[PDB]
Symmetry: D2
Subunit: 310 residues, 4 copies
């Protein structure tokens, strides 16, 4: 029967706060029917699989378990959250040894699905994942600025008192210090922020600048206050997972392979893209202001120098 | 890529009030990613496909269209609602000529999924569908008493003022005049109706009898009041569709093939069963009282005489 | 207890294909906890209440019943759906007057019940009967709401979505004006993931200007096409009504295209007309004034002008 | 406007792994519209409010913030989570007394705020602190609710589900008593699609009586196992709390196993203990008295008796 393939399977690599939260999000929202959890700490994963399974009588069912790389053989989706924290080039090299020890055995399993990469530094490790896996460009995807974008929208939403789902604004570039806001195209119900400020002059230019600074530095603030950041990215990863598994052709800001867009080549970087069951379908090229295009070039340039050196 | 198969496709046969409502239910609940609508009246289906597509910006996306039997080639699910209304043997023979004109071209398409049958008379046309299609027993499924059961639960729920999802009661047998309630196992939060009546003697025995009579005759009442019945069965069909497509192993009352259960053989009849992506996994055999087992035998016997004659 | 108020109640007026389908949408999505159905045809509503109730064991619970205007006393929401349709003899003014007699016979008893909630109007012609509902009810402007161009907007987005092969939730485009023949598309602000249709066409010159014009014409005329093919249109508006209902009942501050009262916006006054607006538990919070091109602003002025002449003539 | 009340507000007390996870569950499932987070550690709550807010553009909106007891004034729901844990030196009575000082310092200011909603208690030891919360708050019995054996019950169902390979939503089995070492399974009424486990074992004699005993032991001891493997347990109870929260806020009349006040049921009095009960916007509506076997009724009596001795000793 053809319907024997109506069983969706995710392998999660990394059972820290991000991965564990991701899994919980998938459980509550009933996305996928199987989650295998892989981590160096086998006892932690066993415990989490049980704790997560305890939730299932209140949601749709799932097979959940402590897993091994070899369980990726027939998986739809491999989600990588296992990122060693911090020179930048040292950080990269350290995470490359670890990433290779994950990707190689996964490929050897026979895995033939989509890689979703969230480990920091995400754009770089997305490129590294593509390079190591030998998979096509469109089937290796990074979370990129999906979270920064969410943070940006929520910030705007709170300022104007509107549901964030009605706010449309991007953060683009390499996720990190060099990312930038696309104010030229940011809007609320089609009314741009430039037009919004006209109609509501209480909103000072300097508020908007600070708003983006707060977004860019949001991880530092959250870590300072509570030790770690995880609910945002977990929620984003589940959103991306759903777009793939329900074949949505949704537009999301993701780390995607650059083949000419924005005058860039041979890096993964953050931009809006269309995604479905087969991964990336279209890379959307927002036409940026000169100011904005300069930010993109700088972000890309610095990123590319590090990859080449790496 | 393996994820190229994360696209779920339903072909609906019959675009009357039942089928149209089913489709709407699937749209709102975001179940499946494609619905092809097939009916003799091509203009009606074209119109419905458009009207249903107009809803999609408020839900998850779907490809929806007026379709042909040949579009079942790669479908997960074929839902048959096309039932000519009313001797009983005449009714059957009439619906068999029509059913054959549907099933044969669907099989010829290469369809290799699950048949879900709702056309009346459902248990008989479920058997006929199995016989005509040549598919395995567990991949031809009828809606059976899923709707009668829902009606029963809601009736009880209203009487005791409790959420129907907390009421557990079955109607079994052949869907129609000979179906019967399983009071022996019916309960609310594990407290049986027999035990409930003990604790709440306001509930008269004669109320319960009438309650089941009202259930058995519910279609006649609804038709008399508003011309047709459709929201219940559409909702049930969508529930069954979800159990299959999300591989739930849910327990539902369905028309399933009898291989010894209740001392019955070689008919489709209504009983609780476990269902998932591969259709029927287990037929549950409720142990009935003598009174209840007699009702099952009679229901089955009459049904079997009609099939044999047919 | 304060939580005694955590029970949401909708009174639906009109149990035709729109109202019935609305109710079904509310049932499946679990939106309020009580739906009373009111219509001249009491048997129909009794039958629908039962048929809808049959769905409840698969969804969250609800009290559903055939209802009377007096049941609006403590309702959150009154949804009005069944406009008397235009007969081939009649003028637009005739259609309005006919529907005003009927509308009054609904709104007055509802107000007399003590109802103190929000009116959601979908009956055609919607912008006019939204105004009439405000005028008859005496309620505040922001607590009388029409569905306006929410459906036309959905149709527009889905059309674009299909052309570019993208999830319509990722397409952001409005139809504005009076819902009907004089409505118009806001191409200047329409976009897909922030890339405008003007910018999209630059990158994809296969997309001919004429395709876009026709695409909007097909949207404007969509009801005629659907009615011709299957007799009636209902799934789109029912779904929209349920979406608006959810924005109110879950206090969302969602931006939707709705028929809202005009107090200067677009250089218009004292009509209800279609534009994006922010809506929550208290009804309309902000009317968004999209800054239009000259061409687009002209369409809005014409739509408004014709609408206003009819209202003025109607109430005299 | 009456719809000004269509804004649901939860105050969470305790921002440990349970409370935080609860809040996240409420966010993802779109349950109330406002969550105020209260904890001795103000920086933690500020950070969580932000981190949770980051999720909102993917879900329905919510106002989320670091909060104070006085923010309970107009709350629907107060959820209490962070019991001070038992130190290796201390008696059960010591644990209770310690948690009573703390609980009082929470409940009194909440009551003083004007809060007039429902208390949902999850702090361990839950049945006792549910009673203490009732006693301290002065609220009615049916508006103070503990999570009781809702989680143990979930664990039990999932265990059975896994053994028989069936969706746990199709498994109907309770754990009852005081949540903890003295709780017990109700095999007599446990079933899968109406077929009892006694009847299931008849049809499937592979299933050994000893497997079932161990299955319950594993459930009873599940917290110890999970804590041993990963340090803490939280996803199960958070999910349960969100389920109970939804039953209240959507006025469901759902049947759940909860810690409820005993007024004769099972021949018990004046304790909170775990049994199925019907719950809606006004809290507890019916306590369901499952008729137990002699063996099962004995377990309930023992569980209750030990619990009652501790409460009596505690309040003197
Ligand atoms: O993906 P984008 O460009 O931000 O748009 C996503 C959002 O669009 C929406 O459809 C609403 O936006 P608009 O209503 O202005 O079109 C939501 O469904 C969704 O959360
Ligand atoms: O399929 P059955 O036998 O009626 O049970 C289905 C129902 O069981 C439930 O889990 C609740 O029933 P209980 O809470 O008594 O176990 C619901 O999730 C679901 O609607």
């Amino acid at each position: 029967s053809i319907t024997d393939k109506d069983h969706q399977k995710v392998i999660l690599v990394g059972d820290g706060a991000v991965g564990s939260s991701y899994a919980y999000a998938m459980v509550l929202q009933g996305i996928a029917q199987e989650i295998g959890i892989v981590d160096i700490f086998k006892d932690k994963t066993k415990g989490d699989a049980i704790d997560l399974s305890n939730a299932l009588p209140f949601t749709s069912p799932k097979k959940i378990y402590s897993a091994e790389y070899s369980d990726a053989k027939d998986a739809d989706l491999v989600v990588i959250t296992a990122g060693a924290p911090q020179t930048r080039l040292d950080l990269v090299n350290k995470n490359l040894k670890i990433l290779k020890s994950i990707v190689d055995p996964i490929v050897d399993s026979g895995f033939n699905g989509i890689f979703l990469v969230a480990a920091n530094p995400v754009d770089i490790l997305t490129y590294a994942t593509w390079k190591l896996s030998g998979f096509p460009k469109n089937r290796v995807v990074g979370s990129g600025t999906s979270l920064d974008t969410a943070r940006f929208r929520q910030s705007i939403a709170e300022m104007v008192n509107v549901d964030a789902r009605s706010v449309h604004a991007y953060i683009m570039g390499e996720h990190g210090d060099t990312e930038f806001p696309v104010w030229s195209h940011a809007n609320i119900g089609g009314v741009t922020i430039a037009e919004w400020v006209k109609a509501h002059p209480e909103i000072k230019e300097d508020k908007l600048v600070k708003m983006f600074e707060d977004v860019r530095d949001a991880a530092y603030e959250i870590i300072k206050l509570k030790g770690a950041t995880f609910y945002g990215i977990a929620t984003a990863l589940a959103r991306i997972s759903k777009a793939i598994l329900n074949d949505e052709n949704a537009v999301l800001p993701l780390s995607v392979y650059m083949d000419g867009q924005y005058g860039l080549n041979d890096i993964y970087i953050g931009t809006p893209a269309v995604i479905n069951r087969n991964g990336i379908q279209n890379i959307l090229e927002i036409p940026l202001t000169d100011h904005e295009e300069e930010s993109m070039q700088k972000s890309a340039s610095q990123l590319k120098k590090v990859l080449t050196d790496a």
